[PDB]
Design a binder for these strands. Sequence first.
RNA 1: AAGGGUGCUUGACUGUGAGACAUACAGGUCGAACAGGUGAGAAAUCAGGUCAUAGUGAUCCGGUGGUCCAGUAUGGAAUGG
RNA 2: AUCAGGACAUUAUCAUGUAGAGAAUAGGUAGGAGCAAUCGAUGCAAGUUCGCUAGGACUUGUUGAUGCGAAAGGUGGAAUACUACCCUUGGUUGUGUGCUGUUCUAAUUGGUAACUGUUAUCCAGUUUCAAGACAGUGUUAGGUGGGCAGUUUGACUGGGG
RNA 3: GGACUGUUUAACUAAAACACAACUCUAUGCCAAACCGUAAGGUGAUGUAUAUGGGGUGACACCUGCCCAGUGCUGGAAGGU
RNA 4: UGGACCUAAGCUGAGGCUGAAAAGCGUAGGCGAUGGACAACAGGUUAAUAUUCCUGUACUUACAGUUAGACUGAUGGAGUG
RNA 5: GGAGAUGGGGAGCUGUAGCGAAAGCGAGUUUUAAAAGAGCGUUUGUUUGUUAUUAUAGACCCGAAACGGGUUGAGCUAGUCAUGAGCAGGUUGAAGGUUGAGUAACAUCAACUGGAGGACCGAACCGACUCUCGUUGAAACGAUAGCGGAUGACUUGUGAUU
RNA 6: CCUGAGUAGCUCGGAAAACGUUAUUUUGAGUGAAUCUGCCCAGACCAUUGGGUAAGCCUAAAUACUAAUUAGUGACCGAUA
RNA 7: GGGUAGGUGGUAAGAACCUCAGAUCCGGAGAUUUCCGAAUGGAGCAAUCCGGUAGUUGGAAACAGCUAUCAUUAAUUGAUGAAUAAAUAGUCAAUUAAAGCAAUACGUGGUGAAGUGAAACAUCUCAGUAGCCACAGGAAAAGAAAACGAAUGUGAUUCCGUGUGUAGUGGCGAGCGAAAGCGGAACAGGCCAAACUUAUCAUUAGAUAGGGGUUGUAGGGCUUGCAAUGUGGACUUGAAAA
Lengths: 144, 63
Amino acid sequence: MKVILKQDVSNLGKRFDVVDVKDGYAIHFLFPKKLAAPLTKKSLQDRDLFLKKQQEHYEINKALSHKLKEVIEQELHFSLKEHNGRPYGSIITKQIINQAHTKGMALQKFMFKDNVRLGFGDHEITLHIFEDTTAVLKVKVTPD
Amino acid sequence: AKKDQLTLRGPLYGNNRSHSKTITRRKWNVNLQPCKVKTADGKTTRILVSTRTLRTLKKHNRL
RNA sequence: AAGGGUGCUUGACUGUGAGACAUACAGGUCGAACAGGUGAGAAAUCAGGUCAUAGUGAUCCGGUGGUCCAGUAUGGAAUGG
RNA sequence: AUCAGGACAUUAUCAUGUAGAGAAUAGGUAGGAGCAAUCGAUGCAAGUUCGCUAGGACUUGUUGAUGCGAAAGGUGGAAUACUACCCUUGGUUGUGUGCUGUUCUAAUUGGUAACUGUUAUCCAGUUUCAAGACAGUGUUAGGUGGGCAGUUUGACUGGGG
RNA sequence: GGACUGUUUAACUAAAACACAACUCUAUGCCAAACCGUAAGGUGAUGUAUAUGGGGUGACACCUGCCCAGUGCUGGAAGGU
RNA sequence: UGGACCUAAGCUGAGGCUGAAAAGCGUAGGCGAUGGACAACAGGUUAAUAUUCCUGUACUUACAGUUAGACUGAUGGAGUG
RNA sequence: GGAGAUGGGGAGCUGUAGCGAAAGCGAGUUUUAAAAGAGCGUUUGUUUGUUAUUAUAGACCCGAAACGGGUUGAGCUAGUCAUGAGCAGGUUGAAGGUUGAGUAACAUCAACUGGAGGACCGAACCGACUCUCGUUGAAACGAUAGCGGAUGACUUGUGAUU
RNA sequence: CCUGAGUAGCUCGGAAAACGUUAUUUUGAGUGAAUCUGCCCAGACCAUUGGGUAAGCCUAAAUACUAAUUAGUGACCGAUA
RNA sequence: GGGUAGGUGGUAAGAACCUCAGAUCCGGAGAUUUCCGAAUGGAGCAAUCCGGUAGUUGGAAACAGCUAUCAUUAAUUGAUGAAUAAAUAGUCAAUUAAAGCAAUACGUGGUGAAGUGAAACAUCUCAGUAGCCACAGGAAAAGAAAACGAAUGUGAUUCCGUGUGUAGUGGCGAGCGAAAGCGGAACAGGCCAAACUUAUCAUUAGAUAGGGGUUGUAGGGCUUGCAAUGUGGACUUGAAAA
Ligand SMILES: [Mg+2]
Ligand SMILES: [Mg+2]
Ligand SMILES: [Mg+2]
Ligand SMILES: [Mg+2]
Ligand SMILES: [Mg+2]
Ligand SMILES: [Mg+2]
């Protein structure tokens, strides 16, 4: 088992620390955003170097998150079949992701927060890029 | 085949020695679970893997 | 009298057993005599359950009590005897 | 993953209890002769709990320096303040477990649909939809189980039953 | 006697047996239940309770009484093991 | 009559699914007439063959080369079958 | 080593001290307080040949019905499935429909049409109720003569399947 | 500093080993260590003493068998063998 | 090459030839080697049917001669490419292996009965036997101690005799039956992982190829010196000889 947390303080009192209890296949193991620390060098060996790498990926998380914000705010156009504005089917996170590759951006659909769009027109969708960084993406649904 | 794919550990054949020691041939099947895995080329795959190797995969961080 | 009453006790002993009976085997039955330490009795004597004949069931396995037995190298123990 | 509930321990915290006599609500064994005052009394107001309708205590606000017959009286089998250890019963922050009960999803499932490999009702992959840590599945353990299997089911016997 | 027409023990029994139309009871809410298969898979069904499987009676008419102690079946919510 | 055309029940079955093993299931494809589609009649002859050979008269399906006309129109859609 | 007798090969086997459950003791030893008593002992070998008997292997021979495992068979027959064929001949004359009467309009009735049915009589066809014959037969289940169904839950060929 | 981790063990069901499950050895399910002052072993077990270092691989020879090629043998058969 | 004087396979005489320019015959090496058959272009009722592709010849052209090639699977290499932008699945091509058979025998491994014995029978035995199945091999398997096991001890494995029908195990019934020790046949023990070091991988290497090192009277690595040039084979190519 690997006790480590990363990128935030999640659901309990802790820090960017190894303060992690044995849960096994839980929020520890199906969350590929927190360290799986091997405690054979994570006492003092992997302490400072991985700490500085944490700040490196932390600052480049701000960096690339801001860059993808610039990409987002420099509009997703998803065309759909609508009956005078009300659609036949529905615009969910996967369509929004796939259409965001028209901007060259590969984003996970799990960062796109919200419920299914059933209408023509504009929608501002919240994008959880990181624990403390959320972007606004404009999504435009047009009749085809 | 009801054996796993990482290793080839198959069923074990033994006796159902009940009370009064009547023998009856019986099979033991490995615990097979559909947990995923990630290879070092992408190609995430779903493989029927036994639980004993699932633990090894879990500690070597092969997911 | 081997029956009835009384006094005293517990031989309703331990360790044995020459010689016989009847027996396919297993088993059963009787018993002089010897050592230890006793009871009754003045003493001789008697007493190893009852007047006699039935009243009971192998082996294996496991348990219980004692032990001048062993204890998978040694000391113990477990486990056996 | 998360929230709620109640149970038993305990970290820190209070109390809790009426046979009579005993100035009174005596739970047991001690060290015990003094003890209180800004870790603030007499008199009063409110209240949780408790109930012997009388009492206890805890918690607050005002009060302000004179006090304890619940030290010494006196009782009684056990005797009074003050520092401790042990019982009955309740509330608390706290964990530790599991127990039922919710919600949510990423594991997982699909004989919901769409798409591609593809001229393919199997299949694999992506998405959707419904379920949802249940189900199915491996081991382990109870129950019903002639559906199924291997077997016994005596002998004498004026024939055998 | 059985309602009928039919089927049956090739090669000793064609019948009063079996079937049947109709009746009732029960199971089953769809990945249905039952079933074959170790499982995949498949039937049921390219069906959906006016449908499907099973038990029992056996056209048509009239009737189908009493007992829920025992066995079985269904439900139960506190307790006991 | 049948292949070289077609498919039914069904059989086989790349990949694939399931199964200690062999094998089992199954998709695309492929096979599979008892069926669909396809153009020849009469008479004569030999010991033995005959819509097969011969005589007489026919039709079909391909292939080029040629004359004239016309823009053809499928591995797929539809109708017919 | 002549697919030899044999030579090497002492590792082991039996006998030479028994008794006791055993440590142990030792011509004694176990039981026993007992050195009494009793039990058991206080020397008669071994290796081969041959014969009798015996043990484990089928073990004198022949003899089951059966038990289990793997395969081969649905070309007869039973069922299902695809696809085809067959039922001479003759009767009865349904339901429905058209018309006429009747009905306030129905209902009902009469004529005509129509041509149903697990219908009728009976050959091919299928089946197999009775007698007689034959029963080492013509025949490993039949013949003459009768017999039931014969447009249907029918009969039958070809192919596939359990 | 290194000396083979879901590993040796421990638990639930079974078995190989002479042993009918027991030290040793293997394992379908669950859990799960240590690092030369170590780890395992000497029929449950602990201490002392002593032996050996798993959890990685490879290995001729002696051994089993002869349908086959060649030479040859037989106190083996001699056409119901 | 040998070897001579006959020969053209047996039921087989005759007919017609070859041969003593050295045939037939015998031995070595070669080539041919229709069709089916693992069968493999596609089928299929085995030994038959129907083809594609690329050459060449004939032909005016269909078409016919004559050649080669055309299964699936696995590994590797290259190209291409989806839902989806990249990527992977997939598809196409090239090269290399096997798929099968049999010696009714031997070996290993998986799975695994019953008859019978117990005077019946279930625990048990028959039996890990037969059978089914996979896999080779000339032999296989096993194997160089986390050992034996009771000692001033042996020192990989295998096989034979004995230990012994013992110690034990068994409804303590039937039955089963070692491991030590001892005498023998044969005899060899080698090599990786990891410490450390090198080069390179967006070096996030935790990866790729080297050096180094192989273990128990503990060893190896790390720092420092001396002695070494050699045996040895579980083994590559040539030459010569028997
Ligand atoms: Mg008496
Ligand atoms: Mg008496
Ligand atoms: Mg000892
Ligand atoms: Mg009836
Ligand atoms: Mg009746
Ligand atoms: Mg020991």
